Amino acid sequence: QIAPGQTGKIADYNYKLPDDFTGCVIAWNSNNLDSKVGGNYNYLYRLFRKSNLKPFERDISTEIYQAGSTPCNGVEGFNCYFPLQSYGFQPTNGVGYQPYRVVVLSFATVCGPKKSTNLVKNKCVNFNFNGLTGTGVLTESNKKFLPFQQFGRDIADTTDAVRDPQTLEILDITPCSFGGVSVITPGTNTSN
Amino acid sequence: AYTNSFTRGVYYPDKVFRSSVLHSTQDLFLPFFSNVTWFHNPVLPFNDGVYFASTEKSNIIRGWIFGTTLDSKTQSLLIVNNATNVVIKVCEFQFCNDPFLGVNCTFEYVSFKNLREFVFKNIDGYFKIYSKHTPINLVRDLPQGFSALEPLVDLPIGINITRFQTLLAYYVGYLQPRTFLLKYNENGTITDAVDCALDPLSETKCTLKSFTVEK
Ligand SMILES: *[C@@H]1O[C@H](CO)[C@@H](O)[C@H](O)[C@H]1NC(C)=O
Ligand SMILES: *[C@@H]1O[C@H](CO)[C@@H](O)[C@H](O)[C@H]1NC(C)=O
Ligand SMILES: *[C@@H]1O[C@H](CO)[C@@H](O)[C@H](O)[C@H]1NC(C)=O
Ligand SMILES: *[C@@H]1O[C@H](CO)[C@@H](O)[C@H](O)[C@H]1NC(C)=O
Ligand SMILES: *[C@@H]1O[C@H](CO)[C@@H](O)[C@H](O)[C@H]1NC(C)=O
């Protein structure tokens, strides 16, 4: 019952997800801690409620239901019931009646992990450091950045040093090697 | 009450090392020789950003409050020194009609003889804190001098801010989008700066991109 698009007694009266839910649902079998032989009536659930929920209504409100036309001031005799029941979890229950711990993860400050390579000096590399990129030779430097400075710039606004973010040491980026290939020749008329 | 800002209110505008170079830049900076409002805890506008500076003798000035409405209607910043710690929180705080110290949250963190200098600005929902500290021996104003505030703290708050107040002398001015020419020295510290739009000689220095000009 725990999804976008799904229906049921929980999905109408306890726990709705938006039908385009930004997130995931995770669940695992918990017979081995949530259940004991006396009946772990510890966990409750909303068996009855008027109208329907919206997504994410944790409506703790607990008063007697009443269906059709009757008044009800407690007593809960007929056509009116107390809205909650316990789960009768016991370690001897069958698989579909066992307890399960559910977690829903629902979705700027959060990110997954961003994973470094080891760092190679004195070779031509296609580098990335924090937000930037380049092609270069990365080399140890005698520059002295201030503690908060992360990059360092050449006079024509071209980056030419960077702080490594893990080991706080300064690299002197050099451009990777390029040059013209000139062919030097006597005339073909002579020799090839 | 008011006083003259002189040449204060320069901070390092981005985290990039520049060395022995006169880098021209535009950002929210305090205009040179503008008036700062002078205080010995009223609620103030924040506008585009604030330069706050505070002369100290006994740890009198403990922190700041920032928001739009500043009374639990929406989330709001509280930054405080309390004895041996610094606190930062962003909660829909109920705030007192006169907040002071004796003798729904999304971000929380808990770790005259002096002048303290601070720049507060809010850009694309990130809130920027730049600051500097120094000894002094002055009793009535910000001392005429030059200092560059390094960044400290750069918080993904996402909150709107248009009003702030202090918690317990201090001085307040507002940042504006102006061109500055910054002299980065041989070690990458900003040792001097020129506010272009100040006077014809500053426009000249900036247009030539030098702190000195021949005839
Ligand atoms: C990164 O981890 C190393 C240990 O491998 C540690 O020595 C270094 O100080 C850490 N750096 C930062 C910035 O946390
Ligand atoms: C160059 O080659 C041509 C043949 O294609 C020949 O007739 C001519 O004499 C040669 N000249 C020289 C200087 O080698
Ligand atoms: C306000 O600033 C001007 C300079 O622009 C100055 O002449 C004037 O005296 C200042 N006002 C006060 C009350 O200090
Ligand atoms: C400052 O106040 C915080 C509560 O916001 C408390 O946890 C901390 O221990 C206090 N620090 C000192 C030095 O009193
Ligand atoms: C740069 O900093 C070092 C300390 O790390 C200091 O010895 C040196 O004199 C400084 N250079 C300049 C030009 O201030």
Short mmCIF file of C-alpha atoms and ligand atoms in Angstrom, two decimals:
data_model
loop_
_atom_site.label_atom_id
_atom_site.label_comp_id
_atom_site.label_asym_id
_atom_site.label_seq_id
_atom_site.Cartn_x
_atom_site.Cartn_y
_atom_site.Cartn_z
CA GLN A 1 0.00 0.00 0.00
CA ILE A 2 3.04 2.33 0.57
CA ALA A 3 3.56 4.11 -2.79
CA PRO A 4 2.47 6.73 -5.30
CA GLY A 5 -0.72 5.44 -7.09
CA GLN A 6 -1.53 2.75 -4.43
CA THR A 7 -4.78 2.41 -2.40
CA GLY A 8 -5.83 0.60 0.82
CA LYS A 9 -6.70 1.16 4.53
CA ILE A 10 -3.25 2.66 5.26
CA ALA A 11 -3.13 4.55 1.94
CA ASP A 12 -6.57 6.22 2.63
CA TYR A 13 -6.36 6.76 6.42
CA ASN A 14 -2.68 6.64 7.61
CA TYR A 15 0.11 7.22 5.07
CA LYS A 16 -0.29 8.82 1.61
CA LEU A 17 2.51 9.58 -0.85
CA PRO A 18 1.95 12.06 -3.79
CA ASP A 19 1.28 10.11 -7.04
CA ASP A 20 4.49 11.68 -8.59
CA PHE A 21 6.50 11.04 -5.33
CA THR A 22 10.07 12.48 -5.34
CA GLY A 23 11.68 9.62 -3.41
CA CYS A 24 11.95 5.95 -2.46
CA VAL A 25 10.47 3.34 -0.12
CA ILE A 26 12.63 0.89 1.84
CA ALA A 27 11.36 -1.92 4.12
CA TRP A 28 12.83 -4.90 6.07
CA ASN A 29 11.43 -7.87 8.09
CA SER A 30 11.46 -7.08 11.84
CA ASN A 31 9.93 -10.20 13.52
CA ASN A 32 13.27 -10.47 15.40
CA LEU A 33 12.77 -7.18 17.39
CA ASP A 34 9.22 -5.70 16.89
CA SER A 35 7.44 -8.97 17.98
CA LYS A 36 7.27 -11.01 21.27
CA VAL A 37 5.06 -14.02 22.23
CA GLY A 38 2.74 -12.00 24.55
CA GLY A 39 1.47 -9.99 21.52
CA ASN A 40 3.31 -6.70 21.02
CA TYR A 41 0.19 -4.49 20.97
CA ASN A 42 2.64 -1.51 21.30
CA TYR A 43 2.17 -0.36 17.67
CA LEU A 44 -1.22 1.25 16.81
CA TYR A 45 -2.94 2.17 13.51
CA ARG A 46 -5.94 4.26 12.34
CA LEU A 47 -8.55 1.58 11.41
CA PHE A 48 -11.30 4.26 11.00
CA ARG A 49 -11.42 7.93 9.92
CA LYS A 50 -13.85 10.30 8.10
CA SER A 51 -13.22 11.64 4.54
CA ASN A 52 -9.60 10.81 3.41
CA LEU A 53 -6.00 12.01 4.09
CA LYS A 54 -3.80 14.28 1.95
CA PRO A 55 -0.15 13.12 1.39
CA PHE A 56 1.97 13.38 4.60
CA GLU A 57 -0.90 14.05 7.12
CA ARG A 58 0.41 12.73 10.45
CA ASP A 59 -3.01 13.60 11.96
CA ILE A 60 -2.62 12.34 15.60
CA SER A 61 -6.30 13.44 16.27
CA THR A 62 -8.08 10.65 18.16
CA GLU A 63 -11.91 10.81 18.54
CA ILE A 64 -14.76 8.30 17.89
CA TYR A 65 -15.66 7.67 14.19
CA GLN A 66 -19.52 7.45 13.74
CA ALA A 67 -20.99 6.36 10.35
CA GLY A 68 -24.30 7.44 8.74
CA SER A 69 -26.51 9.56 11.07
CA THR A 70 -25.81 8.88 14.76
CA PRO A 71 -24.52 11.17 17.53
CA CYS A 72 -21.62 9.52 19.65
CA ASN A 73 -20.00 10.93 22.97
CA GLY A 74 -17.75 7.96 23.74
CA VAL A 75 -19.28 4.52 24.71
CA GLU A 76 -18.80 3.54 21.03
CA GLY A 77 -21.80 1.10 21.07
CA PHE A 78 -23.00 0.70 17.42
CA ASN A 79 -22.19 2.48 14.08
CA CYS A 80 -19.39 4.33 16.05
CA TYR A 81 -15.89 2.99 16.99
CA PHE A 82 -12.66 4.22 18.60
CA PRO A 83 -10.48 5.07 15.57
CA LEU A 84 -7.25 3.16 16.50
CA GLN A 85 -6.34 -0.53 16.82
CA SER A 86 -3.12 -2.27 17.86
CA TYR A 87 -1.08 -4.59 15.66
CA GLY A 88 -1.00 -8.09 17.22
CA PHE A 89 2.62 -8.81 16.28
CA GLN A 90 3.98 -12.17 17.55
CA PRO A 91 7.20 -14.02 16.40
CA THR A 92 5.03 -17.02 15.36
CA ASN A 93 2.99 -14.95 12.78
CA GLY A 94 3.16 -15.91 9.05
CA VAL A 95 5.29 -13.77 6.68
CA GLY A 96 2.59 -11.29 5.53
CA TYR A 97 1.41 -10.72 9.17
CA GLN A 98 4.97 -10.21 10.51
CA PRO A 99 6.16 -6.64 11.41
CA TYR A 100 8.35 -4.71 8.94
CA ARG A 101 10.29 -1.51 9.63
CA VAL A 102 9.60 0.90 6.77
CA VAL A 103 11.63 3.98 5.91
CA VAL A 104 10.57 6.47 3.23
CA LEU A 105 13.19 8.90 1.95
CA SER A 106 11.46 11.96 0.41
CA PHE A 107 13.24 14.70 -1.55
CA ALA A 108 20.74 23.48 -1.26
CA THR A 109 22.19 21.19 1.40
CA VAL A 110 22.12 17.41 0.56
CA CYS A 111 24.27 15.54 -1.84
CA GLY A 112 25.71 12.13 -2.53
CA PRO A 113 29.49 11.60 -2.07
CA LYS A 114 31.92 13.11 -4.66
CA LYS A 115 34.95 10.78 -4.96
CA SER A 116 38.57 11.78 -5.68
CA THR A 117 41.26 9.93 -7.60
CA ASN A 118 44.78 9.65 -6.25
CA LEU A 119 46.86 12.67 -7.44
CA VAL A 120 49.59 12.44 -10.15
CA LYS A 121 52.31 15.14 -10.54
CA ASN A 122 54.71 15.86 -13.43
CA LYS A 123 52.49 14.19 -16.12
CA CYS A 124 50.02 15.47 -18.72
CA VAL A 125 46.57 15.13 -17.11
CA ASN A 126 42.95 16.14 -17.67
CA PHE A 127 42.38 17.55 -14.19
CA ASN A 128 39.41 18.63 -12.05
CA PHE A 129 39.82 20.37 -8.63
CA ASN A 130 36.65 21.42 -6.70
CA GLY A 131 34.59 23.40 -9.31
CA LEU A 132 37.24 23.66 -12.07
CA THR A 133 38.83 21.70 -14.93
CA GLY A 134 41.81 21.86 -17.29
CA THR A 135 44.50 20.09 -19.32
CA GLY A 136 47.99 20.58 -17.88
CA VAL A 137 51.12 19.43 -16.16
CA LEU A 138 50.53 19.65 -12.38
CA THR A 139 53.69 20.41 -10.38
CA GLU A 140 54.70 21.29 -6.77
CA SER A 141 55.04 25.07 -6.21
CA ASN A 142 56.75 27.72 -4.08
CA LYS A 143 53.50 29.84 -4.11
CA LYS A 144 51.86 30.79 -0.78
CA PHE A 145 48.08 31.09 -1.04
CA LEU A 146 46.12 32.63 1.85
CA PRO A 147 44.23 29.95 3.88
CA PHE A 148 40.86 30.67 2.16
CA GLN A 149 42.24 30.96 -1.44
CA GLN A 150 41.58 27.89 -3.62
CA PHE A 151 42.82 28.83 -7.13
CA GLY A 152 45.47 31.28 -8.39
CA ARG A 153 45.46 33.43 -11.56
CA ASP A 154 47.82 34.58 -14.33
CA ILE A 155 47.71 38.24 -15.52
CA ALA A 156 45.43 37.57 -18.56
CA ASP A 157 42.77 35.94 -16.27
CA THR A 158 44.02 32.36 -16.92
CA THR A 159 44.21 30.01 -13.88
CA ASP A 160 47.81 28.86 -13.16
CA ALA A 161 47.84 27.43 -9.60
CA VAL A 162 45.43 25.39 -7.40
CA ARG A 163 45.25 24.22 -3.77
CA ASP A 164 44.69 20.43 -3.50
CA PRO A 165 41.51 20.18 -1.35
CA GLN A 166 42.49 17.07 0.72
CA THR A 167 46.17 17.82 1.40
CA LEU A 168 46.34 21.66 1.65
CA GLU A 169 49.35 22.11 -0.69
CA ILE A 170 49.69 24.33 -3.77
CA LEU A 171 50.24 23.07 -7.34
CA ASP A 172 51.66 25.18 -10.13
CA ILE A 173 49.54 24.26 -13.20
CA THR A 174 51.58 24.51 -16.42
CA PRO A 175 49.97 24.32 -19.92
CA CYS A 176 50.29 20.91 -21.59
CA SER A 177 52.85 20.94 -24.36
CA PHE A 178 52.03 22.27 -27.85
CA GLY A 179 54.02 23.67 -30.80
CA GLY A 180 54.14 24.08 -34.59
CA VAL A 181 55.55 21.21 -36.69
CA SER A 182 57.70 22.83 -39.34
CA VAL A 183 59.17 20.81 -42.20
CA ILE A 184 62.60 21.99 -43.35
CA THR A 185 63.40 20.95 -46.88
CA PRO A 186 65.59 21.28 -49.96
CA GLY A 187 63.38 21.49 -53.05
CA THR A 188 61.72 18.20 -54.09
CA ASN A 189 63.52 18.74 -57.39
CA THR A 190 66.63 17.79 -55.38
CA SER A 191 65.98 15.18 -52.68
CA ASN A 192 63.02 13.88 -50.67
CA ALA B 1 24.81 60.35 14.68
CA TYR B 2 27.19 59.65 11.75
CA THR B 3 30.92 59.43 10.85
CA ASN B 4 33.10 59.22 7.69
CA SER B 5 33.90 55.61 6.45
CA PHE B 6 37.35 56.59 4.99
CA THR B 7 38.96 53.66 3.02
CA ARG B 8 37.44 50.75 4.99
CA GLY B 9 35.02 48.07 3.71
CA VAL B 10 37.17 46.06 1.26
CA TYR B 11 37.04 42.25 1.37
CA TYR B 12 38.55 39.58 -0.94
CA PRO B 13 35.78 39.34 -3.60
CA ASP B 14 36.61 35.75 -4.70
CA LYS B 15 38.83 32.88 -3.40
CA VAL B 16 41.52 33.36 -6.12
CA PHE B 17 45.22 34.09 -5.41
CA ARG B 18 46.56 37.04 -7.42
CA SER B 19 50.12 38.24 -6.80
CA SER B 20 51.77 41.66 -7.44
CA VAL B 21 48.84 42.72 -9.70
CA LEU B 22 46.27 45.54 -9.73
CA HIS B 23 43.08 43.51 -10.32
CA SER B 24 39.96 45.51 -11.29
CA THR B 25 36.64 44.03 -10.01
CA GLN B 26 32.91 44.85 -9.57
CA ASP B 27 30.89 43.56 -6.59
CA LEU B 28 28.88 44.89 -3.63
CA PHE B 29 31.53 47.11 -1.87
CA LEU B 30 31.22 49.93 0.72
CA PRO B 31 31.80 53.25 -1.21
CA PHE B 32 34.99 55.00 0.04
CA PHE B 33 34.45 58.17 2.16
CA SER B 34 30.64 57.58 2.40
CA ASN B 35 28.90 58.30 5.76
CA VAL B 36 28.42 55.35 8.19
CA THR B 37 25.69 55.57 10.83
CA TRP B 38 27.22 55.56 14.33
CA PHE B 39 25.81 53.68 17.37
CA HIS B 40 26.98 53.34 21.02
CA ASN B 41 20.20 48.23 19.35
CA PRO B 42 17.67 49.69 16.81
CA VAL B 43 16.30 47.54 13.97
CA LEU B 44 17.97 48.61 10.70
CA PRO B 45 17.31 47.96 6.99
CA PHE B 46 19.76 45.51 5.31
CA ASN B 47 19.25 46.67 1.67
CA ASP B 48 21.77 44.93 -0.73
CA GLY B 49 24.22 44.11 2.14
CA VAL B 50 25.87 45.64 5.22
CA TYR B 51 29.31 46.60 6.37
CA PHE B 52 29.22 46.36 10.18
CA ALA B 53 32.23 47.41 12.26
CA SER B 54 32.66 47.48 16.00
CA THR B 55 35.25 48.98 18.36
CA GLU B 56 35.78 46.82 21.46
CA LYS B 57 37.15 47.02 25.03
CA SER B 58 35.46 44.14 26.96
CA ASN B 59 33.60 41.77 24.52
CA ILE B 60 30.43 44.01 24.67
CA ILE B 61 29.16 43.26 21.11
CA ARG B 62 28.01 39.64 20.87
CA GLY B 63 26.21 39.17 17.57
CA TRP B 64 23.39 39.85 15.10
CA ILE B 65 19.85 38.95 14.04
CA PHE B 66 18.74 39.00 10.33
CA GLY B 67 15.39 38.51 8.50
CA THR B 68 12.49 40.26 6.73
CA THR B 69 9.74 40.53 9.43
CA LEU B 70 11.87 39.30 12.40
CA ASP B 71 9.03 37.79 14.52
CA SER B 72 8.44 34.01 13.84
CA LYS B 73 6.24 34.65 10.70
CA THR B 74 9.19 33.20 8.64
CA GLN B 75 12.70 31.67 9.23
CA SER B 76 15.42 34.11 10.44
CA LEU B 77 19.15 34.19 11.37
CA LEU B 78 20.56 34.33 14.92
CA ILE B 79 24.38 34.56 15.36
CA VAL B 80 25.66 34.90 18.98
CA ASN B 81 28.75 34.74 21.16
CA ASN B 82 27.76 33.25 24.54
CA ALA B 83 30.71 33.09 27.00
CA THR B 84 33.01 30.48 25.42
CA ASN B 85 31.17 29.72 22.20
CA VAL B 86 29.66 30.86 18.95
CA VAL B 87 26.11 29.80 17.99
CA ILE B 88 24.40 30.04 14.57
CA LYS B 89 20.72 29.09 13.93
CA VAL B 90 18.07 30.01 11.29
CA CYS B 91 14.76 29.28 13.12
CA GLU B 92 11.32 30.94 13.02
CA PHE B 93 12.45 32.79 16.17
CA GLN B 94 10.01 34.74 18.29
CA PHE B 95 12.14 37.88 18.87
CA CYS B 96 11.93 40.26 21.80
CA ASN B 97 10.90 43.93 21.32
CA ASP B 98 14.39 44.78 22.76
CA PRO B 99 16.73 41.69 22.35
CA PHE B 100 19.95 41.59 24.49
CA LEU B 101 22.26 39.33 26.61
CA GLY B 102 22.81 39.67 30.42
CA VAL B 103 25.92 39.93 32.68
CA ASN B 104 11.07 25.19 12.38
CA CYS B 105 14.79 24.98 11.60
CA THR B 106 16.97 24.23 8.57
CA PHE B 107 20.52 25.18 9.74
CA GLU B 108 21.99 25.02 13.27
CA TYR B 109 25.61 25.02 14.47
CA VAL B 110 27.35 25.25 17.85
CA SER B 111 31.15 25.11 18.12
CA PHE B 112 38.78 51.00 22.79
CA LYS B 113 41.52 48.28 22.47
CA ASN B 114 40.13 46.30 19.48
CA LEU B 115 38.32 46.79 16.17
CA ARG B 116 36.23 44.07 14.54
CA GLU B 117 35.05 44.47 10.94
CA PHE B 118 32.30 42.45 9.20
CA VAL B 119 30.67 42.33 5.74
CA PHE B 120 27.30 40.60 5.34
CA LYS B 121 25.78 39.93 1.89
CA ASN B 122 23.10 37.52 0.55
CA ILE B 123 23.55 36.22 -3.04
CA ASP B 124 21.51 33.45 -4.72
CA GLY B 125 20.37 32.25 -1.24
CA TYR B 126 23.96 31.85 0.04
CA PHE B 127 24.73 34.19 2.96
CA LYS B 128 28.35 35.45 2.98
CA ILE B 129 30.30 36.52 6.09
CA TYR B 130 33.70 38.24 5.61
CA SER B 131 35.58 39.59 8.66
CA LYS B 132 38.80 41.14 10.07
CA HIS B 133 40.13 41.86 13.61
CA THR B 134 42.86 44.27 14.82
CA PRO B 135 44.17 46.04 17.94
CA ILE B 136 43.52 49.85 18.14
CA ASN B 137 43.96 52.85 20.54
CA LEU B 138 40.98 55.14 19.64
CA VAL B 139 37.78 56.21 21.49
CA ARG B 140 35.48 58.05 19.04
CA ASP B 141 35.44 56.64 15.48
CA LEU B 142 36.60 53.99 13.00
CA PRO B 143 40.37 54.74 12.68
CA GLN B 144 41.52 56.01 9.26
CA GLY B 145 43.30 53.03 7.66
CA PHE B 146 43.12 50.15 5.20
CA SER B 147 42.30 46.47 5.80
CA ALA B 148 40.93 43.64 3.65
CA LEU B 149 38.36 41.25 5.23
CA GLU B 150 39.00 37.57 4.39
CA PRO B 151 35.89 35.32 4.09
CA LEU B 152 34.92 33.16 7.12
CA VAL B 153 31.46 31.62 6.61
CA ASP B 154 29.25 30.89 3.58
CA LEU B 155 25.88 29.45 4.53
CA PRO B 156 23.23 27.80 2.25
CA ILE B 157 20.37 29.50 4.21
CA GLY B 158 18.01 30.26 1.22
CA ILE B 159 16.14 32.86 3.43
CA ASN B 160 15.12 36.41 2.35
CA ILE B 161 16.77 39.24 4.42
CA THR B 162 15.83 42.98 4.37
CA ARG B 163 16.14 43.94 8.09
CA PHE B 164 18.74 43.20 10.85
CA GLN B 165 19.74 44.19 14.44
CA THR B 166 22.66 43.85 16.95
CA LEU B 167 22.99 41.95 20.29
CA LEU B 168 24.96 43.28 23.33
CA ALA B 169 30.47 50.96 19.98
CA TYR B 170 29.56 50.11 16.33
CA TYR B 171 29.11 51.64 12.86
CA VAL B 172 26.93 50.62 9.85
CA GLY B 173 27.06 51.28 6.09
CA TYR B 174 25.49 49.63 3.01
CA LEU B 175 27.30 47.87 0.15
CA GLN B 176 26.75 49.04 -3.49
CA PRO B 177 27.69 47.53 -6.92
CA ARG B 178 30.87 49.49 -7.70
CA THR B 179 34.18 49.04 -9.53
CA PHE B 180 37.25 48.76 -7.30
CA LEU B 181 40.88 48.41 -8.41
CA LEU B 182 42.62 46.13 -5.83
CA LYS B 183 46.42 46.01 -5.31
CA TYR B 184 47.28 42.39 -4.58
CA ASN B 185 50.85 42.32 -3.20
CA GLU B 186 53.67 39.75 -3.72
CA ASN B 187 52.15 37.34 -1.17
CA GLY B 188 48.57 37.67 -2.46
CA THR B 189 47.22 39.98 0.30
CA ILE B 190 45.22 43.04 -0.85
CA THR B 191 47.42 45.88 0.53
CA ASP B 192 45.64 48.85 -1.18
CA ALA B 193 42.44 49.63 -3.21
CA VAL B 194 40.88 52.48 -5.35
CA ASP B 195 37.12 53.22 -5.54
CA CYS B 196 36.77 54.28 -9.20
CA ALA B 197 33.65 56.45 -9.08
CA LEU B 198 34.97 58.53 -6.09
CA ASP B 199 36.73 61.42 -7.95
CA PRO B 200 38.40 62.18 -11.36
CA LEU B 201 41.83 60.95 -10.18
CA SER B 202 40.34 57.57 -9.15
CA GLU B 203 38.50 57.23 -12.50
CA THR B 204 41.91 58.01 -14.09
CA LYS B 205 43.84 55.38 -12.04
CA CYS B 206 41.22 52.76 -12.89
CA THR B 207 41.01 53.64 -16.60
CA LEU B 208 44.83 53.43 -16.86
CA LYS B 209 44.79 50.41 -14.44
CA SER B 210 47.59 51.76 -12.23
CA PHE B 211 47.73 53.27 -8.69
CA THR B 212 50.15 55.97 -10.04
CA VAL B 213 50.00 58.00 -13.29
CA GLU B 214 52.61 60.09 -15.14
CA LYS B 215 51.56 63.59 -16.31
C1 LIG C 1 42.24 14.62 4.88
O1 LIG C 1 42.61 13.31 5.44
C2 LIG C 1 44.03 13.21 5.81
C3 LIG C 1 44.27 11.79 6.30
O2 LIG C 1 44.28 10.86 5.22
C4 LIG C 1 44.36 14.27 6.91
O3 LIG C 1 45.74 14.20 7.26
C5 LIG C 1 44.02 15.68 6.36
O4 LIG C 1 44.28 16.66 7.37
C6 LIG C 1 42.52 15.74 5.96
N1 LIG C 1 42.24 17.06 5.37
C7 LIG C 1 41.13 17.76 5.55
C8 LIG C 1 41.02 19.09 4.86
O5 LIG C 1 40.21 17.33 6.27
C1 LIG C 2 63.50 20.01 -61.85
O1 LIG C 2 62.78 18.85 -62.36
C2 LIG C 2 62.37 18.99 -63.77
C3 LIG C 2 61.60 17.72 -64.14
O2 LIG C 2 60.30 17.71 -63.57
C4 LIG C 2 63.63 19.18 -64.67
O3 LIG C 2 63.24 19.37 -66.02
C5 LIG C 2 64.41 20.43 -64.18
O4 LIG C 2 65.59 20.61 -64.99
C6 LIG C 2 64.82 20.22 -62.70
N1 LIG C 2 65.57 21.39 -62.20
C7 LIG C 2 66.52 21.33 -61.26
C8 LIG C 2 67.17 22.62 -60.87
O5 LIG C 2 66.84 20.26 -60.73
C1 LIG C 3 27.02 63.19 5.85
O1 LIG C 3 28.05 62.99 4.85
C2 LIG C 3 28.55 64.27 4.27
C3 LIG C 3 29.57 63.92 3.20
O2 LIG C 3 28.94 63.37 2.05
C4 LIG C 3 29.16 65.15 5.41
O3 LIG C 3 29.59 66.40 4.87
C5 LIG C 3 28.07 65.41 6.48
O4 LIG C 3 28.62 66.20 7.55
C6 LIG C 3 27.58 64.05 7.05
N1 LIG C 3 26.50 64.25 8.03
C7 LIG C 3 26.64 64.11 9.35
C8 LIG C 3 25.43 64.35 10.18
O5 LIG C 3 27.72 63.77 9.85
C1 LIG C 4 26.11 28.50 24.62
O1 LIG C 4 24.70 28.17 24.44
C2 LIG C 4 24.47 26.84 23.85
C3 LIG C 4 22.96 26.68 23.67
O2 LIG C 4 22.50 27.42 22.55
C4 LIG C 4 25.07 25.75 24.80
O3 LIG C 4 24.89 24.46 24.23
C5 LIG C 4 26.58 26.03 24.98
O4 LIG C 4 27.15 25.04 25.86
C6 LIG C 4 26.78 27.44 25.58
N1 LIG C 4 28.22 27.72 25.68
C7 LIG C 4 28.81 28.32 26.71
C8 LIG C 4 30.29 28.51 26.61
O5 LIG C 4 28.16 28.70 27.70
C1 LIG C 5 54.69 36.27 3.22
O1 LIG C 5 54.41 35.42 4.38
C2 LIG C 5 55.62 34.89 5.03
C3 LIG C 5 55.17 33.99 6.17
O2 LIG C 5 54.62 32.77 5.68
C4 LIG C 5 56.51 36.07 5.53
O3 LIG C 5 57.71 35.57 6.11
C5 LIG C 5 56.86 36.98 4.32
O4 LIG C 5 57.66 38.09 4.76
C6 LIG C 5 55.55 37.51 3.68
N1 LIG C 5 55.84 38.35 2.51
C7 LIG C 5 55.48 39.62 2.38
C8 LIG C 5 55.85 40.33 1.11
O5 LIG C 5 54.86 40.21 3.28
#
